[PDB]
Write a protein that holds these residues in place. Structure first.
Motif, mmCIF file in Angstrom:
data_model
loop_
_atom_site.group_PDB
_atom_site.id
_atom_site.type_symbol
_atom_site.label_atom_id
_atom_site.label_comp_id
_atom_site.label_asym_id
_atom_site.label_seq_id
_atom_site.Cartn_x
_atom_site.Cartn_y
_atom_site.Cartn_z
ATOM 1 N N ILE A 17 20.857 46.573 48.503
ATOM 2 C CA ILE A 17 21.636 47.672 47.929
ATOM 3 C C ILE A 17 21.428 47.834 46.434
ATOM 4 C CG2 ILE A 17 23.452 47.477 49.668
ATOM 5 C CD1 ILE A 17 25.172 46.085 47.625
ATOM 6 N N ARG A 18 20.612 46.987 45.810
ATOM 7 C CA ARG A 18 20.291 47.094 44.387
ATOM 8 C C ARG A 18 21.567 47.141 43.544
ATOM 9 N NH1 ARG A 18 18.505 52.078 40.770
ATOM 10 N NH2 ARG A 18 17.637 50.944 38.981
ATOM 11 N N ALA A 19 22.305 46.037 43.576
ATOM 12 C CA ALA A 19 23.594 45.938 42.905
ATOM 13 C C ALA A 19 23.512 44.972 41.733
ATOM 14 C CB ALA A 19 24.684 45.480 43.877
ATOM 15 N N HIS A 20 24.232 45.294 40.652
ATOM 16 C CA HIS A 20 24.362 44.340 39.555
ATOM 17 C C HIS A 20 25.314 43.215 39.931
ATOM 18 C CE1 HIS A 20 28.429 45.286 38.100
ATOM 19 N NE2 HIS A 20 28.157 46.562 38.301
ATOM 20 N N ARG A 21 26.367 43.529 40.690
ATOM 21 C CA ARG A 21 27.114 42.469 41.354
ATOM 22 C C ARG A 21 26.207 41.683 42.291
ATOM 23 N NH1 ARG A 21 29.859 42.283 46.803
ATOM 24 N NH2 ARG A 21 28.657 43.768 48.064
ATOM 25 N N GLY A 22 25.125 42.305 42.766
ATOM 26 C CA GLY A 22 24.120 41.561 43.504
ATOM 27 C C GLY A 22 23.457 40.494 42.656
ATOM 28 N N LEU A 23 23.148 40.822 41.399
ATOM 29 C CA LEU A 23 22.623 39.807 40.490
ATOM 30 C C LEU A 23 23.681 38.767 40.147
ATOM 31 C CD1 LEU A 23 20.334 41.769 37.991
ATOM 32 C CD2 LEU A 23 19.654 40.054 39.683
ATOM 33 N N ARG A 24 24.955 39.163 40.124
ATOM 34 C CA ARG A 24 26.023 38.177 39.988
ATOM 35 C C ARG A 24 26.000 37.189 41.149
ATOM 36 N NH1 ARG A 24 28.905 39.577 34.933
ATOM 37 N NH2 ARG A 24 30.976 39.266 35.853
ATOM 38 N N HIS A 25 25.852 37.703 42.372
ATOM 39 C CA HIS A 25 25.839 36.858 43.563
ATOM 40 C C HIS A 25 24.600 35.971 43.613
ATOM 41 C CE1 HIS A 25 29.339 37.457 45.946
ATOM 42 N NE2 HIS A 25 29.161 38.748 46.163
ATOM 43 N N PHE A 26 23.442 36.514 43.236
ATOM 44 C CA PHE A 26 22.152 35.885 43.503
ATOM 45 C C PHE A 26 21.689 34.966 42.378
ATOM 46 C CE2 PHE A 26 17.741 36.646 42.064
ATOM 47 C CZ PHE A 26 17.077 35.786 42.915
ATOM 48 N N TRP A 27 21.744 35.427 41.126
ATOM 49 C CA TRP A 27 21.320 34.596 40.003
ATOM 50 C C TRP A 27 22.231 33.399 39.775
ATOM 51 C CZ3 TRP A 27 19.557 38.302 35.452
ATOM 52 C CH2 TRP A 27 18.164 38.447 35.526
ATOM 53 N N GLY A 28 23.386 33.353 40.427
ATOM 54 C CA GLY A 28 24.371 32.333 40.158
ATOM 55 C C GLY A 28 25.424 32.732 39.154
ATOM 56 N N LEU A 29 25.478 34.004 38.770
ATOM 57 C CA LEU A 29 26.474 34.478 37.821
ATOM 58 C C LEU A 29 27.801 34.703 38.542
ATOM 59 C CD1 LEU A 29 24.539 36.859 35.402
ATOM 60 C CD2 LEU A 29 25.521 34.609 34.929
ATOM 61 N N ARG A 30 28.755 35.297 37.841
ATOM 62 C CA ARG A 30 30.134 35.350 38.299
ATOM 63 C C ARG A 30 30.416 36.730 38.883
ATOM 64 N NH1 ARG A 30 30.487 31.283 37.863
ATOM 65 N NH2 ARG A 30 32.653 30.975 38.527
ATOM 66 N N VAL A 31 30.437 36.819 40.216
ATOM 67 C CA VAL A 31 30.696 38.098 40.873
ATOM 68 C C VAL A 31 32.118 38.583 40.628
ATOM 69 C CG1 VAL A 31 31.653 38.016 43.214
ATOM 70 C CG2 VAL A 31 29.469 39.142 42.787
ATOM 71 N N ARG A 32 33.050 37.680 40.333
ATOM 72 C CA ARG A 32 34.368 38.070 39.849
ATOM 73 C C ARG A 32 34.423 38.159 38.332
ATOM 74 N NH1 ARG A 32 34.069 40.821 42.087
ATOM 75 N NH2 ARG A 32 36.174 41.658 41.746
ATOM 76 N N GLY A 33 33.803 37.214 37.629
ATOM 77 C CA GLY A 33 33.654 37.345 36.196
ATOM 78 C C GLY A 33 34.366 36.320 35.340
ATOM 79 N N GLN A 34 34.499 35.080 35.812
ATOM 80 C CA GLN A 34 35.044 34.030 34.956
ATOM 81 C C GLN A 34 34.218 33.915 33.679
ATOM 82 O OE1 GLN A 34 35.152 34.361 37.982
ATOM 83 N NE2 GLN A 34 36.622 33.084 39.091
ATOM 84 N N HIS A 35 34.818 33.346 32.640
ATOM 85 C CA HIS A 35 34.150 33.279 31.350
ATOM 86 C C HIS A 35 33.463 31.931 31.181
ATOM 87 C CE1 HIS A 35 34.497 36.753 28.674
ATOM 88 N NE2 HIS A 35 35.498 37.116 29.455
ATOM 89 N N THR A 36 32.233 31.965 30.658
ATOM 90 C CA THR A 36 31.221 30.974 30.994
ATOM 91 C C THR A 36 30.782 30.042 29.870
ATOM 92 O OG1 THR A 36 29.158 32.083 30.407
ATOM 93 C CG2 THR A 36 30.351 32.914 32.298
ATOM 94 N N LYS A 37 30.945 30.418 28.597
ATOM 95 C CA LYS A 37 30.170 29.768 27.539
ATOM 96 C C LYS A 37 30.484 28.274 27.433
ATOM 97 C CE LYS A 37 30.331 30.693 23.281
ATOM 98 N NZ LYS A 37 30.272 31.569 22.080
ATOM 99 N N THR A 38 31.761 27.909 27.308
ATOM 100 C CA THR A 38 32.152 26.504 27.350
ATOM 101 C C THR A 38 33.041 26.219 28.552
ATOM 102 O OG1 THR A 38 32.604 27.090 25.043
ATOM 103 C CG2 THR A 38 32.341 24.759 25.565
ATOM 104 N N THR A 39 34.194 26.871 28.655
ATOM 105 C CA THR A 39 34.904 26.863 29.916
ATOM 106 C C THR A 39 34.093 27.659 30.930
ATOM 107 O OG1 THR A 39 36.921 27.589 31.039
ATOM 108 C CG2 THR A 39 36.257 28.794 29.051
#
Lengths: 55, 69, 138, 120, 97, 126
Positions: B41-63
Motif C-alpha cells: 500500500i506504499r505507506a509511511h506508517r508502512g516504513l514505521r512498521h517495517f524499518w522498526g520505527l514507531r507506528v504509534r510514535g513513541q519518542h526515541t532519542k534517549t527514552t
RNA sequence: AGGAGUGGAGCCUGCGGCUUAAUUUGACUCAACACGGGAAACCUCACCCGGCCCGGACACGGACAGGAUUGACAGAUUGAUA
RNA sequence: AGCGUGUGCCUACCCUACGCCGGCAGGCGCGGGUAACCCGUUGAACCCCAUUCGUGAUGGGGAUCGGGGAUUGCAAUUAUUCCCCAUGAACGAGGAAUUCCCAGUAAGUGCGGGUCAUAAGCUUGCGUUGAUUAAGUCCCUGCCCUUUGUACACACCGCCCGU
C-alpha cells in the motif's frame, strides 16, 4: 456572509475569545472564580479584590 | 456458543478468514505485523512498521530506546 | 447527665456507650481472636485473665467502630477499654480501684493516651514535594 | 440571577476594585482618598472619602449626578438603586493615597523635589 | 473609517436622545451587554457612537476597558459646531434639581 | 497468477450483495468515522471521483487531481478508484485494491525525513 | 569512615547555524534552556508552498453615477464553497 | 483518602447521578447540584489475596506491536480517545561530569487546581505506603564577625614584567 460563516463549525476551544478585563490582554488569563484578569493585573488588584497572602 | 469472540488472539485477521488453524511456530511477531499488505500500500506508517520505527510514535532519542533496538 | 468520650485514635473511632447490660466479650461484635484482618488480635485477651468472670457481668459497652487504618482502629480499642474501666470504677465504687487498673494498663504501655502527631507536610516551591527540589542545571 | 458564593464574593471584589480605579483616575485631582460600598436591603451606597469635596460634588451636585449616572449605567445597577455620597477624611496626613497625590501635584505644579518631599 | 451612513444618521439621533453614556472599547463586536436593543445591530451602533465621541475634538475618560463620557460644555459646543441643532430638543441634562 | 476472491462475498449489487457488513467482516478504522455525522463541503471529493471514474475507464488513470482535503467517506471500500492527494509540497498516489477496510486515506505521506546533520567539532561532542 | 533516590532497565518537551520550505521572536553561570504561567491546526503565529479586505483630523499629486470589495463543487491557481 | 472544582450577564464550552446493554467510562434519555444539600460513604484503584514460583530467566515483573466495541474533535497522522492473546526487555546496582534531600522527610503512588473542549509526560497543591543514613565538619563549593598583607579600587576575569 455573517450568518453563513458564524457558528458553523463551532469554536469549542476559543483562545482568542477571552482577554483580561483590565488591560485587554490575552496571555496569563486567570478564569478561576470568574476573575478574567491576566496574572499581572491580578497581582496588582488582589488586595482590593480580597485575596491576601497568609502562607 | 455464537458469542462474538473477543477472547481470541486475532479477529478480523488477514491470512485466514475464520479462526482456522495454521502450521509452524516462531512467527507470532510476524503475525502481529503483516508484511505484505503494508508494503504493497506504499505507506509511511508502512516504513514505521517495517524499518522498526514507531507506528504509534513513541519518542526515541534517549527514552524509547527499547522498542526499536 | 451523660459523660461519653468513647475511644478514638488517629482517624478511627470505637463509640463506647457504657451502661449496664450483657457486656459479652466481643470486638466489632465478633469473637475473641477472630478478626478478619488477623493482625493485632491478642490485645484484648490480656486483662480478663486476671480478675475473673464475675467482673464483666454488668458492663455493656456498645461500640460503633468505624475507620480504616490498622494503627488507628487497633490501638483505639485499648484506649476505649481503658476509658471504660476508668469510668466504670470511678463512678461505681471509688477511684482507688480505677487508680489500680489504670495504673497497670497505662504504665503497661504509654501509647494509649498519646497518638502520633506526625502528618503529611506541605509541598513547596520548585520541588516535587516538601523538601526535594527540582534538578539544578549549570 | 443565581451565582455561587465564591463567584459572588470574587465578583464583588472585582466591582470594588474597578470602581476604585475608575473614580481614582476620575477625581484624584480632587484629593480622592478611598471608596466604601454598603449593600443593604434596597440600599446600595457608595461613600467617596476625599480631602476636598467642593469639586467632588461640583456645583448643584452636578458631578455627583454624573458619577451616579455613569456607575449605574456601567455596572448595571437598577435605576435609582445606587446613591453615592462624598464625605471628608478627618486626618488627611495619615493617608498615603492623599499624600502621594499631593506630592505629585506639588511636583507637577512646580517645586524643587527635595522641597516638596520635605514639606510632605 | 469602516462606517456606513444610514446607521450613522440613526446613531446621531440616538446620541441626541441620550447624550451621556458609558461604552466598552470594542470595534467589531455586535454583542455588548449594556447597549443592546436599539432596533439596530449593535456592532454598527456601538462603534458608531465610539467614533462620534472620538473624532478629535471631544474628550473622554477611560480605563478598565470602558469609555466614560460626561456632557461637558465641549460636548455641547461641538454639537453646535458640527450638527448645528440647538438644544431646544431638551436633553436628559436639564432635570434633577 | 489468477485473481483472488474477496472473502467469497459478492459485489454485484451495491447494497444487497455488498456493504451489508458494516462491521461483521469489516474492521475498525472508519467503523464509526463514517457515522460521526455530516457537514458541508463533503461531496466534492466523491463528485471528482465519479467524474474520474466515469469519464476515464479503468486501466487508465485520469488527469492529475491535487487537493489536500481529508474527509469522511461513508464507505472505505473504493475499488478501481484512488484519491490522488497533494501533501506537503508534492503529490502522492497509491495503487488501491479492493481490500481497504482497516486503514486510513491520509497515512501515506513521509513527512518525518531525517533532518540535516551538522558537523560538530572544535569543542566536545560526547 | 554517611547514605537514599541512578542523566542509561516501566509515556516528551525547552533551545543553540545551514535540505529548495521547519529546527518559527525575549532570556545564556549560579541569577537563560515545560522559563515568558509560552500544552501555537483558526484565533494572541509573526523563519508557512503564493496574498485580500483597510488610512487617515495636519500642507498633499489623479479635483465624483461606477474609479469593483468577501461568497459558481462543474473543462482552474501548486492547497484553499473568497 | 484529602486538597479542592462545578452551570443562562457575550459561560447556548459546568460537575455529574440513574436507566441506554455489543462486555462496564460510553453518541440516547431522564433527574440532582450556583453546592457540608447533587456528583459523593468521590463510577472499569493502593499496599494486600492459596492464578504461585520451596529458587529465580517461571507463573515473577511489559520487547516494536494486530483486533472486540470507538468518550464523539473545523485536522489528530502533520500533540484527543479507553482491558486483554506470553513472539522475550543487557529482565536483579551503572563513562570522567554532576543534582536533590534529615521523619511523616527521600522515594514509590495515585487524585484535584491552572492551562482547557474531557484537553498533561508541565507546574501547583493534596493525600496514601513509607524508610536507609546523620545529630558532624570546614576537606571541596561558598557565606559571615576579627586580625593581617597589598604596587588592586574597572576592585584578582585586578595590576603588571621582559625578547
Amino acid at each position: 456572509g455573517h450568518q453563513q460563516l458564524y457558528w458553523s463549525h463551532p469554536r469549542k476551544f476559543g483562545q482568542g475569545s477571552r482577554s483580561c478585563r483590565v488591560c485587554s490582554n490575552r496571555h496569563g488569563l486567570i478564569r478561576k472564580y470568574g476573575l478574567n484578569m491576566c496574572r499581572q493585573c491580578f497581582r496588582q488588584y488582589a488586595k482590593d479584590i480580597g485575596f491576601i497572602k497568609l502562607d | 456458543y455464537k458469542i462474538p469472540d473477543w477472547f481470541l488472539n486475532r479477529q478480523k485477521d488477514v491470512k485466514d478468514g475464520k479462526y482456522s488453524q495454521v502450521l509452524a511456530n516462531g512467527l507470532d511477531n510476524k503475525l502481529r505485523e503483516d508484511l505484505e499488505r503494508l508494503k504493497k500500500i506504499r505507506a509511511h506508517r508502512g516504513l514505521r512498521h517495517f524499518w522498526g520505527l514507531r507506528v504509534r510514535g513513541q519518542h526515541t532519542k534517549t527514552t524509547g530506546r527499547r522498542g526499536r533496538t | 447527665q451523660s459523660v461519653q468520650v468513647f475511644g478514638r485514635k488517629k482517624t478511627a473511632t470505637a463509640v463506647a456507650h457504657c451502661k449496664r447490660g450483657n457486656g459479652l466479650i466481643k470486638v466489632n461484635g465478633r469473637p475473641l481472636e477472630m478478626i478478619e484482618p488477623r493482625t493485632l488480635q491478642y490485645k484484648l485477651l490480656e486483662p480478663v485473665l486476671l480478675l475473673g468472670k464475675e467482673r464483666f457481668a454488668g458492663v455493656d459497652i456498645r461500640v460503633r467502630v468505624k475507620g480504616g487504618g490498622h494503627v488507628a482502629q487497633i490501638y483505639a480499642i485499648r484506649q476505649s477499654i481503658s476509658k471504660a474501666l476508668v469510668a466504670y470504677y470511678q463512678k461505681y465504687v471509688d477511684e482507688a480501684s480505677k487508680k489500680e487498673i489504670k495504673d497497670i494498663l497505662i504504665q503497661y504501655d504509654r501509647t494509649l493516651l498519646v497518638a502520633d502527631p506526625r502528618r503529611c507536610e506541605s509541598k513547596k516551591f520548585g520541588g516535587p514535594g516538601a523538601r526535594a527540589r527540582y534538578q539544578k542545571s549549570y | 440571577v443565581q451565582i455561587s458564593k465564591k463567584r459572588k464574593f470574587v465578583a464583588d471584589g472585582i466591582f470594588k476594585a474597578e470602581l476604585n480605579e475608575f473614580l481614582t483616575r476620575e477625581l484624584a485631582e480632587d484629593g480622592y482618598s478611598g471608596v466604601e460600598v454598603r449593600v443593604t436591603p434596597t440600599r446600595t451606597e457608595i461613600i467617596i472619602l476625599a480631602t476636598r469635596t467642593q469639586n467632588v460634588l461640583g456645583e448643584k451636585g452636578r458631578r455627583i449626578r454624573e458619577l451616579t449616572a455613569v456607575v449605574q449605567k456601567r455596572f448595571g445597577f437598577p435605576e435609582g438603586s445606587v446613591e453615592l455620597y462624598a464625605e471628608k477624611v478627618a486626618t488627611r496626613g495619615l493617608c498615603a493615597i492623599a499624600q502621594a497625590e499631593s506630592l505629585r501635584y506639588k511636583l507637577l505644579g512646580g517645586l524643587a523635589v527635595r522641597r516638596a518631599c520635605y514639606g510632605v | 473609517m469602516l462606517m456606513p451612513k444610514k446607521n450613522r444618521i440613526a446613531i446621531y439621533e440616538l446620541l441626541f436622545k441620550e447624550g451621556v453614556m458609558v461604552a466598552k472599547k470594542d470595534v467589531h463586536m455586535p454583542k455588548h451587554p449594556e447597549l443592546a436593543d436599539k432596533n439596530v445591530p449593535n456592532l454598527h451602533v456601538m462603534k458608531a457612537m465610539q467614533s462620534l465621541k472620538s473624532r478629535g475634538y471631544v474628550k473622554e475618560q477611560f480605563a478598565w476597558r470602558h469609555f466614560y463620557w460626561y456632557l461637558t460644555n465641549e460636548g455641547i459646543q461641538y454639537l453646535r459646531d458640527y450638527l448645528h441643532l440647538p438644544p431646544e430638543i431638551v436633553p436628559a441634562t436639564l432635570r434633577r434639581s | 497468477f489468477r485473481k483472488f476472491t474477496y472473502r467469497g462475498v459478492d459485489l454485484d449489487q451495491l447494497l444487497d450483495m455488498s456493504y451489508e457488513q458494516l462491521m461483521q467482516l469489516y474492521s475498525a478504522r472508519q467503523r464509526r468515522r463514517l457515522n460521526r455525522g455530516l457537514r458541508r463541503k463533503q461531496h466534492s471529493l466523491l463528485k471528482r471521483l465519479r467524474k474520474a471514474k466515469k469519464e476515464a475507464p479503468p486501466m487508465e488513470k485520469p488527469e492529475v487531481v491535487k487537493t489536500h482535503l481529508r474527509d469522511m467517506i461513508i464507505l472505505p471500500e473504493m475499488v478501481g478508484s484512488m484519491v490522488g492527494v497533494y501533501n506537503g509540497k508534492t503529490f502522492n498516489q497509491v495503487e488501491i485494491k479492493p481490500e481497504m477496510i482497516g486503514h486510513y486515506l491520509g497515512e501515506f505521506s513521509i513527512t518525518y525525513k531525517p533532518v540535516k546533520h551538522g558537523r560538530p567539532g572544535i569543542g566536545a561532542t560526547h
